């Protein structure tokens, strides 16, 4: 045939892949963690958004740390041969590098290690997307007026917030980041490469949201998400 390019992931496998959504709203009383009001809005928005991208969505609610590890290990041991990609969305409390099950924390590294190029062979060379709506610390942004491949290759971490910072969630509308992510996927998934979509998400979160609080410490604060890309190709959710 004629000249061929290979700058973009092959996304025309028989299936787009799994979208695992872990929605932790209620936490064991003994942890002292508050309920995450609004997160069901996020989980429903994500389910619909990724359904329209033709992902096989599985929603899981209120998982213990043990259930999270078991679920991710089980999913990584499925045969993904017919699947173009893998997506996991984590909605929970967190700290830098950590997501909370309902009864205690899980290292993000423990979850993502199941999908390493050498540990999940049917996803080797395919994009593995981890979308994380969780705090990465307690900083607040006060804003300003205006033959082998690496085992860590082909991961994308779409973090809701910058390293070290809180992440904002509205109890009525859902989290700033997930709200903006779904809106930008809905509007641009048939048009833009995924890094460009996530950049529009960054701009939407950065410009359209600002906290309102009766507590001066938490009032008038801002947020910027953080795209951490280890991908090796462009990612379009459509194919020719």
């Amino acid at each position: 045939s004629g000249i061929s390019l290979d700058n973009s992931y092959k996304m025309d496998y028989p299936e787009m892949g799994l979208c695992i959504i872990i929605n932790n709203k209620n936490f064991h009383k003994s942890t002292g963690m508050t309920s995450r009001s609004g997160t069901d809005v996020d989980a429903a928005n994500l389910r619909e958004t990724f359904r329209n991208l033709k992902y096989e969505v599985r929603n899981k609610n209120d998982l213990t740390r043990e259930e999270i590890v078991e679920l991710m290990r089980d999913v990584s041991k499925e045969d993904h041969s017919k699947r173009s990609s893998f997506v996991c969305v984590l909605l929970s409390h967190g700290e830098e590098g950590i997501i909370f099950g309902t009864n205690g924390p899980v290292d993000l590294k423990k979850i993502t290690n199941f999908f390493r190029g050498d540990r999940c062979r049917s996803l080797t060379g395919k994009p593995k997307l981890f979308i994380i709506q969780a705090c990465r610390g307690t900083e607040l942004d006060c804003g300003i007026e205006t033959h082998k491949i690496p085992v860590e290759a082909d991961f994308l971490y779409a973090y809701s917030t910058a390293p070290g910072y809180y992440s904002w969630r509205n109890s009525k509308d859902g989290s700033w980041f997930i709200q903006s992510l779904c809106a930008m996927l809905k509007q641009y998934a048939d048009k833009l490469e995924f890094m460009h979509i996530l950049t529009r998400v960054n701009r939407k979160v950065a410009t359209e949201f600002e906290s309102f609080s009766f507590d001066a410490t938490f009032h008038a604060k801002k947020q910027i998400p953080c795209i951490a890309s280890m991908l090796t190709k462009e990612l379009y959710f459509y194919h020719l």
């Binding site: 009001s37 409390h93 709506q133 705090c135 904002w168 109890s171 609080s213 938490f218």
Partner: peptide, 4 residues
């Protein structure tokens, strides 16, 4: 608005 709340933090996570």
């Amino acid at each position: 608005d709340e933090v996570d």
